[model samples]
Target: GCVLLHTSRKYLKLKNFKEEIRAHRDLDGFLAQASIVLNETATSLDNVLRTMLRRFALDLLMAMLFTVHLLSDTIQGVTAVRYQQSWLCIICTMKALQKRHVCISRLVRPQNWGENSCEVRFVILVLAPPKMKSTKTAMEVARTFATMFSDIAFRQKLLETRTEEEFKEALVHQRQLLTMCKDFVPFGKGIREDIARRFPLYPLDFTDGIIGKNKAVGKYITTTLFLYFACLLPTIAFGSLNDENTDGAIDVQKTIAGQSIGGLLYALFSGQPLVILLTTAPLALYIQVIRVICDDYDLDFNSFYAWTGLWNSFFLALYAFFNLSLVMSLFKRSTEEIIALFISITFVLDAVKGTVKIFWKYYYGHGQATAVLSLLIMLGTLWLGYTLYQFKKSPYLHPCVREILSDCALPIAVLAFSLISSHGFREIEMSKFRYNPSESPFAMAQIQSLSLRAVSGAMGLGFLLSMLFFIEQNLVAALVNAPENRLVKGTAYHWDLLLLAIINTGLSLFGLPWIHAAYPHSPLHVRALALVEERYDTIVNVKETRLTSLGASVLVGLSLLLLPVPLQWIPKPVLYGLFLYIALTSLDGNQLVQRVALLLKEQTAYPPTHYIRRVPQRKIHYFTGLQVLQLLLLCAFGMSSLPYMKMIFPLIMIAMIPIRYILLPRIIEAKYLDVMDA
Candidate 1:
């Protein structure tokens, strides 16, 4: 062994041993050594060190705990007491073997083998042959093991491993967990780079997503119909909300026209055709705020919105030109989940609030029967839709039947509930919905009457609107093109922002609501286009077509002429239930909600996901609790009864960036965060 060590050291000096220090590869090397020593056994750290030293005819034994950051050569052999009370070590030896090797011990016997009172909990023994030069110094190898072992969850897994193979498997499992991240338009690039990457593929962005290599005709038809209802209901719902709030300046007709024309244009030309454009609730709120400002200042609502929107469009164009949407790179998973959950919560709350409003409207007098029936319709639709959405997983049905039911879940639920409300409760005046097509779809904002001061204020509000769309639309893009979604067509943050600016230009001039990406709707659009295998358990692939969005918008435009008659009979409660169903279904994939669920689960029963495997339960709870609090704060500020307070929620959403990058790191360990956030 000595002669072999001498020869190896001579060769080490002759050749270069400066191998690339990949963490996983180094771990595998250490594991290989452990496998060789698996045939040998010992109990305590003392016995294992002796066994390693005696068997390999080692010349040196050096031990250091994981917690210690050793630098000075004098303290290289510092004992546990010499450092801290806790113990974990990288035991290094030269001339112990002809080749370098590594092994670990759980330390069955807690020994005072260190200089401190800190009992030996684990030992990572690294053995190597003598060397004039080093491949990776035993200290380097020891540092690698120590870095990994520093994670409490990792240390716990090493403690719990039953056999050498299990130990190797855990390391491999961790290696797999180590690699995962993002998908979106390339960040930190100017418009030139953005277009360079995308302009050549712009044609394919449409062709590939819209008409890919394969086609699913059934999926295309069903998703189109589902999206039709999904897109139409929200447009009318928020349109009516806008009508009442803005005194009919942006009514259902304008909302539908915006959705129809804007959605059609976006479907045809967008870099990401999967993103569904619509009138969102926040934009509706902003419209209401605009109306209030106009009324307070005695300004023409149309003229003010036009000027503000013109300014907003100008800002969006500037952002797109500068490729400022790349700032979304800073908006991490923490912010994404909060926004997704907030949208989810908003849907459920709005549904319930609307349903209860029905009770007070009817039950406050003598017609309580209508109110009761409407509530039932809401509940029934929610239950039926959710059950059918999940029907794909039921073992009792044919795969085809389950697939159809799942694809058309919401539409079917709405139809059934509508029928019940119309047929079963015909005596009651439950037909409380209508959108007349009598209104003109086009009108220019009369900006000639406004003064410079008013135009300047409109300009300021324009900038604010730009800020809102910047954060909201980019987040929508991020979620839609999230890496796990398996979308291959490149993302278009700049391109889409440009599209948004162009559309809003027409919309602002036409006196219609400006449209951008809407959450749950956009993601759900992608999900609806996806082809799932094994009863929706795994998404085989997405249909990735513009046809569904185009077809749905075409239906929205058609609804302007055809829907008013039938939509009158489609009870408001049914749409409320659709809202509830959407809110409930979208929560299925949110990490924040999943982590919250894990808080109640038994330790052994935790799902074998990366976060659960690597993040300690307490740290998981700590991070989750803070996120929940932040979400609540957002809700409180968003719905604030105070003047102008509610409009600042977008800023609150933006604050999550600093919270994640700065505040979170202060409290939680980055190692835990990497796994948790991933």
Candidate 2:
């Protein structure tokens, strides 16, 4: 991302220089040339940095969390703590390097040509690779050190500069000098030698006899088998746990089943090896609410289970259809701008929510623990920001490393910490409302006269709306990350497995909600890790793996039939940790930013054909601010509300958009546009 930004800056400089020369020579032609150059430069720079940064951040976070999963036993508190500590280590290392005398002296000041005459002479002497090794001259050593100094100094200067132009000029000069001396001395020879050793240039060869052919077939078979075992079986087994007449077991089973299916399908069709399917929090809460509704209505538990299944299926279908249509229609419409807008709005929203929480804790009688947790989350975010800045500036590092460092660790850590400290440890026993299957229907019906039907209906509606929004959000993410011409397949089987698991699980055993495939993480992993030619092919191969879910789900489902076994084996904290991890992973900084940026860019650039032709810049700002405010309110409401009120928290988020559009526009304009040209 930094390299791309540097290129764009150099291009802008050249254009500006040419425009100045033209203007000095001919005033009339100057405006036209200058305007054209400026516009083009602005657009290029805007896109280059935006896309690069987005991808870098996203990939980095994915890598860190991926690593975190390896280090931790359970995916909760300690995992997040360790992730934050890793970030701190990286940041502090960079800072220490900056403070070192050698680093500072070399970076801040290079010896002048005359003062470094011996260095220059040595550079000339060691112009060829062999001479330096055979006869090590003082001049050769001086030249080597001088060159190293220059490289470090250049990088340091780039880091120090605040403006884009400074960074561009520094990077461009360094590249130009490096390229000019490409064939000189040890540098050129070293590169050539490394390339030869590591990645020899060779003609493509398909025929490697029987061993290679067998290896290829073996790999495919292994991948296919793994996908079935990991993804398909889990969904079916878990889905069967969703029997009626339990508290929230059915909904939990359905959610787990859905997630399992999504994961299995992703692994099979998308060929992403790392993603593990599991249920999430909002979905779990939705199931709990549904259980309450069933009890209140005096309806047969099975009827509620069936209805929930129907809703899950309906939404899943809607998601698939919409995503397919989006692929067909809007896939090529300069997504960069849309994504940027989306990210900016989300950032502002997040910032606001953070601020509000801090204030609420300080103002209200919220304990020090809450305040401390909030502070830690903010500090963690800042630490990430610091890491990103270092990566952007560091010259010795590879672009890929910078990208990884900036995007992944911070978000996941923050998310994990928030969930573990605040939500994970909460006692579920306080809200125990078990579904009694054998309870007399006549007695239940008589009791229904005194039930809270209105509240139950509202809760159910809220759940439905939240689920719909979640589906839409996932679809958008999938569309954004999906490769060109490729469609996400096997979701139907995934959903079917989930439904089957839920139906068989008896509805109240698991406390999970229905699951959907998380868009960017699943797809991003596939895109970043897979070879270009292999991506679509691997996806197709993995799709076949979803079939395994049937076997696995059945096994798990049957196990659930022995209720005492499940109750004893599955530890609550372990489940909590799993939930915490899933949530944290979802909230990872890079993913969130990319999603938000895409949404914003879409809003500003396209403005929905049904709405205004172009969304004004001020309005964009206001919209962004309003979104932030809404997120803040929702968080505040969630923290303050009692156990029952917590159920409504998701609803608040769903309603945020309409409220913003209706209330904010008449009074304020929140216009903020890309000023790349300037």
Candidate 3:
């Protein structure tokens, strides 16, 4: 069966459509078969449906049924259903007018069709065509119209439309709103291309914003100290998590050393020194998965992980040489936000999940006080750190005071809580190292008895690990070089990936945890150097310099001298709080979080953004719902206790690209999809 959409007093005749339909051999019969009744009483959905079906039987209808059911005085209910019978082709519309130039006939209100009932103010009856390849049935077109009709504003405009031309224009306007816009080679001059791109900017990478007329020594010093604590705290924090997850195979000292050396090397050599480097939550989780694999196979964690790292490092280098970081150019809002939210959620989940472990282990008898105290400290640190992080925007302080407070916020919070926990409560227990640092050496010896399959598995795991960092490393570069950051200096995507490759290879043989781009921190690093105009609060320039990260990494390395003593004062709970703070703060400005919040918001109060104001609510939720589902899948697989399922999580993340660029468009209208992604 065929379906057609028709409106009455449709004064603007469609010459193209008419001529196209007229080209059919049965045009004469179709015109004879198609009929329009001016003032019809079939206002009820059942009545209209019956009338259309009867016409279908009587005329063996060739096409359009323009039946105007007008002047309904009261609200009416309508129900549209798929007919079981086959071999039927009909296009039926029952348009009701509140009042118009043409007599608006009113239909009697139909019987309540219960839950399935759609209000009968306007009835569009569509009958499905024959089952065939690549065709939309009546149900498809009806659902499409249903979504269009769901918009009260669109309906109100339809009610106000006095003529066919106005209605046509209104439709076009809505259609435009619903439609999406029709909208990296690596070095190879090889690595020569990378060097060529980065060579001219090499001197400038350090001195461009430093030695110039507007020197930013003050910003450099403040950001350096800020990044010191900012960078240092997370190393200790993630190292703590990794130490626990990997059963001491990778511990705090290893993570610290990894970040210190990795960050220092990257700062020294990277195209964009504004980009900071460190261990990330995803990398930690991936490390845990590797540990799980080694444990399951009865292989030595050190040897297996070394093999994994060697493979990962090799692949990473391959990516650099082949210029694969160019693929990041294909990623946009969907990929970036998905990965960002995953990291943010991982931060939150790790804190809560780790705290649960604390309670389970320490919350007993006198130790109960320790758990309670730990919980309080965690919450306090989170609150104070988050509150201070917002100090830059707070109205209570001088601009300089606010800036310093915001820049030094997390470190200040950590030190303050550390002092409190150390001095205020003798009964409280702080975190302790599981591995004896005195016994641990600078590097580990690899020893594993492996089958050929085990060896091949290690190779495959290495590729997957490399895949994770390939996307992640370039994505961080993209964020650092984001147009909003207003960085004038050049970016070295290839150079940075190669740096990571070398760093990871060195760290792997040492049994050190691998490091990647640190989020919020890297972005925070950029913000620290940003020069903002006070009145407009816009970033006019960023003081791009290598010194901040360089100095911060030096400080991290120096912290090794203080070691057991300086690091011990910091309680685990405070770090957990830091994790919570990081998670909550990073969640800000995330489109996915904003969209999730919009799910329960009242329609009238939605923010005046392009997607909210223009895209229909149904479409917005469709896009958001799919993202949430994708996020859930990532979380589920990433966190699954089953090691094999957990191992495939990276592949799942890779699958999201297809889901976004291919699968999503099939369901959501391109107009709305683009706005949602946009």
State which candidate has the highest TM-score: 1
The TM-scores, one per candidate, come to 0.73, 0.36, 0.69
Report clash pairs, candidate 1: 65-88, 80-115, 81-115, 81-116, 209-544
Give the per-residue lDDT digits (tens) of candidate 3, residues 1-678.
Answer: 986645332111211211122112122232233322223366344455456456444332312342223211111212243311101112333233111111111133333333333333444444443331111223333334444444557656755665545655665565445442111342343456666777787787678657759777777777888788767777887787888898777777888888889889888887788878888766777788878888777777777778888889999988887777776776677677877888777777777887787788888542777778888999999989988888887789887777777877778888899889888886667554443473357656363544567668779888988987887788877878877678776777777888788989888888888888877677778877887776525677887888899999999998887877656677778878888877787776577898999888765456645465446567778888888888888888876667677656667867888888888889887766676556
Position 460, candidate 2: lDDT: 58
The C-alpha stretches of model 1 lying farther than 4 A from their native spots are 1-213, 434-437, 533-540
lDDT of 3: 0.67
Best by lDDT: 1
Local distance difference test, candidate 2: 0.33
lDDT of each: 0.73, 0.33, 0.67
- Which regions in candidate 2 have their CA more than 4 angstroms from the true location? 1-278, 311-513, 518-628, 637-654, 658-678
Candidate 1 per-residue lDDT over residues 433-494, each given as its tens digit:
55655465476776787888899998888888998888888999898888767876678788
Which lDDT value does model 3 have at 72? 17
State which candidate, 1 or 2, has the greater TM-score: 1
State residue 620's C-alpha deviation in candidate 3, in Å: 2.4
